[PDB]
Design a protein around this nucleic acid. Structure first.
Ligand SMILES: [Ca+2]
Ligand SMILES: [Mn+2]
Ligand SMILES: [Mn+2]
Length: 430
DNA sequence: ATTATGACGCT
DNA sequence: AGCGTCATA
């Protein structure tokens, strides 16, 4: 009872850009705004692979991973923007730089954890305490939450979406105890006021719209974010968790979308996150290991303690290229030329990184895939990274992989390489 | 022949 | 250290 921790100590948000690469291209090219459009890389093979899709195009059934020729079958008027190509490969610099724009704005409000190119977690606990004492016990107006959904509301004793949104918000605010500066629900609510402000600043200063989730931890914040996209934010309270989880497929929770989630379902004979509450912590630890068991036991009750890490910059800087089907690299000269292309982009990104961020990578990781191997990576070897020099980096990468060549004929490369990957790691301040 | 990434956990 | 898992545009 009185000693049962409820995982309500923190206010955590997850902010995630709507259709991000698409918005980046739409900002640049006004002709693409408010249209079914997608971002594609390469073109020769089946029109190129789609990697981002506007909400107008999703309405036609267009998705990520789709070939553009196939997408055009669903949506003949689909507009396309192509990822830049440099040194013979897709180059994602425009999107990385747009990401920095957004991350720097978010960082004005709080410490952030960069979680991907288009999203960050925010620990708003301190900021909330500040805003609360500023408010002086003043109630929170619905006007301060113009894009916020309260998950699970309205409930109990209008047929429009915005009307439903306002109805739930009214019920929520009607119920709040705004005179208790330690109420978790009030704290979340103030968190949501701050995220409205964060999201308004992002849109004002970049043109980009985003969604957000506000809860007590990262997993719930991430889940919440997706509940009402695009261009909206969702508050998931501790109290909303039982109903939310009662019909929530296990695979929807972050880290459970893969093999572990599949095993939870198979071994326990369940489908929904809520069904996990009926197992003891020891039971879950027996099936899924000590760490996962404890994590599952708390997570299904809406509790998780993973901190928002203070990290705005990526820990690694990498360059990779697949060489699929018949384009697999079969000659030493071929392997060396592409190692050089990768190494040249890597040097460019590393040099910019060193100037912007006062750090230097110290380790070069080289990874390849060989034709026929089921796995995404066949081999991963490291060597020292002592100078930002593309020719040296590619020569070194060749050295650490050159013995992988089955061929007695040195000029030939067998088995042919279906992937090359160069990654700079182990940064030190400089 | 989705591709190009990026973080973290295991042994 | 090298491998595997899970994730996102
Ligand atoms: Ca997104
Ligand atoms: Mn995202
Ligand atoms: Mn996505």
């Amino acid at each position: 009872g009185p000693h049962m921790a409820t995982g309500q100590d923190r206010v955590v948000a997850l902010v995630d850009m709507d259709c991000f690469f698409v918005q980046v291209e739409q900002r640049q090219n006004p002709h693409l705004r408010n249209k079914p459009c997608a971002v594609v890389q390469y073109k020769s093979w089946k029109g190129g692979g789609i990697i981002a899709v506007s909400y107008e195009a999703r309405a036609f059934g267009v998705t990520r991973s789709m070939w553009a020729d196939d997408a055009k079958k669903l949506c003949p008027d689909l507009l396309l923007a192509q990822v830049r190509e440099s040194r013979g490969k897709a180059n994602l610099t425009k999107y990385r730089e747009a990401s920095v724009e957004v991350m720097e704005i978010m960082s004005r409000f709080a410490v952030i954890e960069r979680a991907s190119i288009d999203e960050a977690y925010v620990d708003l606990t301190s900021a909330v305490q500040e805003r609360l004492q500023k408010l002086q016990g003043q109630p929170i107006s619905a006007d301060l939450l113009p894009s916020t959904y309260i998950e699970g509301l309205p409930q109990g004793p209008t047929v429009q979406k915005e009307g439903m949104r306002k109805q739930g918000l009214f019920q929520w605010l009607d119920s709040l105890q705004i005179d208790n500066l330690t109420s978790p629900d009030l704290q979340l609510t103030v968190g949501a006021v701050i995220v409205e402000e964060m999201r308004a600043a992002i849109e004002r200063e970049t043109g980009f719209q985003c969604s957000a989730g506000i809860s007590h931890n990262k997993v719930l914040a991430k889940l919440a974010c997706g509940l009402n996209k695009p261009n909206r934010q969702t508050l998931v309270s501790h109290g909303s968790v039982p109903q939310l989880f009662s019909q929530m497929p296990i695979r929807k929770i972050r880290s459970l979308g893969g093999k572990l989630g599949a095993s939870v379902i198979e071994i326990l004979g369940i489908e929904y996150m809520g069904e996990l509450t009926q197992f003891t912590e020891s039971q879950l630890q027996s099936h899924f290991g000590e760490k996962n068991g404890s994590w599952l036991y708390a997570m299904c009750r809406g509790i998780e303690h993973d901190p928002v890490k203070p990290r705005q910059l990526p820990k690694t800087i990498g360059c990779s290229k697949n060489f699929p089907g018949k384009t697999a690299l079969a000659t030493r000269e071929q392997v060396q030329w592409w190692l050089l292309q990768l190494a040249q982009e890597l040097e460019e990104r590393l040099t910019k990184d060193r100037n912007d961020n006062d750090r230097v990578a110290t380790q070069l990781v080289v990874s390849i895939r060989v034709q026929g191997d089921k796995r995404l990576s066949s081999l991963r070897r490291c060597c020292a990274l002592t100078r930002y020099d593309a020719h040296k980096m590619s020569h070194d990468a060749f050295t650490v992989i050159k013995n992988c060549n089955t061929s007695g004929i040195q000029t030939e490369w067998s088995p042919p390489l279906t992937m090359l990957f160069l990654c700079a790691t182990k940064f030190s301040a400089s």
